[PDB]
Amino acid sequence: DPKIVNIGAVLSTKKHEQIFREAVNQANKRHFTRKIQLQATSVTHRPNAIQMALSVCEDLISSQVYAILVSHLTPTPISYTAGFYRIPVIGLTTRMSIYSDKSIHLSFLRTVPPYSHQALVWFEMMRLFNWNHVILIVSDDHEGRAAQKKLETLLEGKPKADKVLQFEPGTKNLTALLLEAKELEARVIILSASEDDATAVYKSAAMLDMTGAGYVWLVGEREISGSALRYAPDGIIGLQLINGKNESAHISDAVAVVAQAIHELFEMENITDPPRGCVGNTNIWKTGPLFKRVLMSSKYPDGVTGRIEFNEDGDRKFAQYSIMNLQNRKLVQVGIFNGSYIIQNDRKIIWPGG
Amino acid sequence: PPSIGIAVILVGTSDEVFHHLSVVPRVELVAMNETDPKSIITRICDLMSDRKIQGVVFADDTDQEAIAQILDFISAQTLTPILGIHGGSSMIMADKDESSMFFQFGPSIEQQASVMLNIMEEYDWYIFSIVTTYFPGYQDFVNKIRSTIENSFVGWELEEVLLLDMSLDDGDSKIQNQLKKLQSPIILLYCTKEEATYIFEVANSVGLTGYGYTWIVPSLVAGDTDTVPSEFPTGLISVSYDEWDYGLPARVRDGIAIITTAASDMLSEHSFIPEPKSSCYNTHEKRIYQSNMLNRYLINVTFEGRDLSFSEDGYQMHPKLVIILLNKERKWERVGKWKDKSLQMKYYVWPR
Numbered sequence: 001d002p003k004i005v006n007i008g009a010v011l012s013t014k015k016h017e018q019i020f021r022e023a024v025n026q027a028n029k030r031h032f033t034r035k036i037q038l039q040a041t042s043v044t045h046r047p048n049a050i051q052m053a054l055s056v057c058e059d060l061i062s063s064q065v066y067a068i069l070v071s072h073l074t075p076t077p078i079s080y081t082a083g084f085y086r087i088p089v090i091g092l093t094t095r096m097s098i099y100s101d102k103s104i105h106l107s108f109l110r111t112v113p114p115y116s117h118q119a120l121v122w123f124e125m126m127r128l129f130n131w132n133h134v135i136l137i138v139s140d141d142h143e144g145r146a147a148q149k150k151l152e153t154l155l156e157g158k159p160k161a162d163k164v165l166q167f168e169p170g171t172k173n174l175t176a177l178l179l180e181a182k183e184l185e186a187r188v189i190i191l192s193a194s195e196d197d198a199t200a201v202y203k204s205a206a207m208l209d210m211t212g213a214g215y216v217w218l219v220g221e222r223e224i225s226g227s228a229l230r231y232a233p234d235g236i237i238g239l240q241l242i243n244g245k246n247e248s249a250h251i252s253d254a255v256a257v258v259a260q261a262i263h264e265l266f267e268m269e270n271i272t273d274p275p276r277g278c279v280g281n282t283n284i285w286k287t288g289p290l291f292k293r294v295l296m297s298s299k300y301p302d303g304v305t306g307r308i309e310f311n312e313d314g315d316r317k318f319a320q321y322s323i324m325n326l327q328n329r330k331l332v333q334v335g336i337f338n339g340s341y342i343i344q345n346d347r348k349i350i351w352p353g354g
Numbered sequence: 355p356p357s358i359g360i361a362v363i364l365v366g367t368s369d370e371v372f373h374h375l376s377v378v379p380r381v382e383l384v385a386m387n388e389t390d391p392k393s394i395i396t397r398i399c400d401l402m403s404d405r406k407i408q409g410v411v412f413a414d415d416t417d418q419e420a421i422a423q424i425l426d427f428i429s430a431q432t433l434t435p436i437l438g439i440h441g442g443s444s445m446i447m448a449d450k451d452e453s454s455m456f457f458q459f460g461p462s463i464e465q466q467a468s469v470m471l472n473i474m475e476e477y478d479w480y481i482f483s484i485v486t487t488y489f490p491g492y493q494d495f496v497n498k499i500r501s502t503i504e505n506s507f508v509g510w511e512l513e514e515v516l517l518l519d520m521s522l523d524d525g526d527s528k529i530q531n532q533l534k535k536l537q538s539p540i541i542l543l544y545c546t547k548e549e550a551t552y553i554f555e556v557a558n559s560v561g562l563t564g565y566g567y568t569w570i571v572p573s574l575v576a577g578d579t580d581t582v583p584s585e586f587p588t589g590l591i592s593v594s595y596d597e598w599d600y601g602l603p604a605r606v607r608d609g610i611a612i613i614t615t616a617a618s619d620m621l622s623e624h625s626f627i628p629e630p631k632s633s634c635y636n637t638h639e640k641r642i643y644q645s646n647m648l649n650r651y652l653i654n655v656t657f658e659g660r661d662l663s664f665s666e667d668g669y670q671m672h673p674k675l676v677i678i679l680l681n682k683e684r685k686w687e688r689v690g691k692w693k694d695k696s697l698q699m700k701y702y703v704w705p706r
């Protein structure tokens with residue numbers, strides 16, 4: 001009879017809890033579970049960040065989980081709590097670039113890429129259409145400035161190529177910025193904001209003839225999130241990330257990789273179990289650092305979401321986005337981005353103003 | 355006359371210990387044994403839903419820098435002002451949550467770094483090297499020194515910024531390999547006290563903790579001036595919060611003050627005070643705006659004595675900063691004092 005190791009998960013529906021209970025099992029069949037054998041403990045999101053974080057303790061740490069998969073708050077409870085103990089957390093659908101900061105979420109892994117990586121496409125796009133002077137409008141928050149960095153880093157290869165206008169999140173009238181942008185006199189414009197905030201830029205730019213011919217509107221995914229298209233200038237270009245919303249498809253592959261890697265861990269001597277309680281324990285789980293090292297160095301082909309590699313920060317190394325052009329009221333897809341290079345669709349781009 | 359509850363979670367302290375303003379405080383002291391998340395979270399959540407609390411002074415006698423983080427969490431989430439007087443509950447947490455009402459006794463990382471450069475400004479220790487880990491504030495720290503330098507006629511020379519990753523296995527002695535780069539008289543180290551001790555055992559290993567090299571560190575590293583680790587080098591100059599003249603009970607008084615002056619000012623002008631926290635689980639934006647307001651008072655406070663103002667950022671504006679040194683006997687000795695402007699040091703010629 002074998003060692004029983006747990007995997008936790010905070011899951012969006014009770015159904016997903018079953019897809020995860022089963023995933024752990026197909027892994028407990030594909031292995032060969034005689035020394036260690038996995039076991040799946042999971043919760044549903046509690047809506048309150050404290051209720052949530054207590055649960056991580058009582059419902060999941062109590063079961064000595066080696067990792068927790070995640071799907072009024074975002075995963076900050078599951079990360080502040082388990083991250084204390086250094087139990088690796090794996091976010092399945094979290095796109096926010098905040099979680100890519102080692103300083104704040106040091107035991108954190110995610111199967112989707114952060115929004116900031118849309119910059120990669122924004123870059124290779126400019127290379128394709130030889131855009132050498134762009135104006136970058138960014139929410140002055142971590143997510144916006146997150147995007148500003150990755151794009152600017154990308155421009156170092158040879159920051160004069162982008163002029164940057166930031167704005168206070170939640171601002172209502174944005175003409176002041178925009179008229180400053182109109183004085184700055186550029187044709188290409190990259191945006192980083194939320195649905196509600198991009199909406200406001202979308203409006204104020206309509207009041208100033210910045211929605212029309214000559215301009216290009218380059219953009220991410222929240223920026224054409226729902227409710228935001230009613231006001232976005234015709235000829236915008238946005239991005240949606242391929243299969244980035246499938247909590248089920250991601251539960252599949254994560255468990256595969258945690259499984260591969262929980263097994264990977266036991267080739268080592270001097271292995272220790274994470275704490276049982278939260279109560280009483282105020283020292284890191286000793287192996288949890290090494291475990292994190294393992295997951296990161298794990299690569300997985302034939303994963304249902306694609307090949308699951310991991311970069312220096314524990315994001316998904318490569319990612320594909322369906323590029324999107326808005327025309328009249330239909331969001332045609334003029335091309336995909338294959339993680340490396342762009343590939344155009346048969347449909348051609350309809351710029352702002354034909 | 356109107357009451358305000360003020361819980362005082364005091365973690366391991368066998369001690370004990372004057373106001374004429376509009377709201378009188380109903381203080382209620384409490385101690386706790388554990389400093390883990392569920393333990394800290396659940397204490398404060400009950401002292402509300404039972405005892406109608408309205409703010410928290412919170413002190414411990416530990417180096418658990420993560421206590422600060424758990425308290426910021428609890429504060430933002432309940433829009434209740436939490437004050438971190440002593441211990442890990444007062445090691446500067448660089449970036450706090452937007453909505454948080456949590457303030458700590460002690461200097462900004464930028465303050466300290468400015469102290470540390472004032473210290474080499476004296477003995478002309480102008481050739482140096484920054485070391486960090488990825489603890490919150492490494493960027494702020496390194497940039498703060500880098501910033502003071504770039505525009506000085508003085509001959510600062512910064513030889514290497516080392517950023518050490520401690521979230522990995524350490525099984526490859528890359529950290530060891532990384533410190534090989536280091537070769538400078540003054541090496542500045544930003545990292546936790548638990549993080550500090552490993553950087554030394556490898557520094558002692560590489561002969562960098564040998565004499566001829568000088569390691570300056572911020573408060574958190576020193577931490578508890580009583581506990582002086584084996585792995586710590588003899589002579590690890592540091593800034594620290596001057597408990598020498600500033601007693602623990604002396605703090606808790608000032609904790610009580612700030613919160614109560616804050617409430618007191620607010621009543622004076624707005625003619626109302628936050629209704630006591632309903633429940634840890636009862637979270638509204640019905641309290642977003644009251645909370646935002648009271649923070650404006652929490653941050654601009656004068657007591658019987660001095661100016662106890664904070665910044666919006668969490669740190670303290672004018673703290674009680676003392677420089678210290680680890681002597682031959684493994685003891686911390688006051689070598690210097692940061693007057694509110696210039697610093698008075700003990701030794702003209704540094705102890706050869």
Ligand SMILES: *[C@@H]1O[C@H](CO)[C@@H](O)[C@H](O)[C@H]1NC(C)=O
Pocket residue numbers: 173174175
């Ligand atoms: C935005 O502000 C300008 C002047 O500050 C004003 O002329 C304009 O009408 C405003 N737009 C809206 C939609 O209120």
Ligand SMILES: *[C@@H]1O[C@H](CO)[C@@H](O)[C@H](O)[C@H]1NC(C)=O
Pocket residue numbers: 243246248249
């Ligand atoms: C999402 O995952 C489900 C499994 O629950 C799968 O059947 C479906 O094809 C996936 N959808 C997409 C768009 O990939």
Ligand SMILES: *[C@@H]1O[C@H](CO)[C@@H](O)[C@H](O)[C@H]1NC(C)=O
Pocket residue numbers: 269270
């Ligand atoms: C593991 O622990 C043993 C003692 O139980 C020790 O001999 C060995 O060196 C350790 N392994 C490593 C890689 O340090």
Ligand SMILES: *[C@@H]1O[C@H](CO)[C@@H](O)[C@H](O)[C@H]1NC(C)=O
Pocket residue numbers: 653654655656661662663
């Ligand atoms: C209070 O705040 C003002 C700015 O509103 C500042 O100039 C002043 O120095 C502060 N006073 C105290 C006593 O903290």
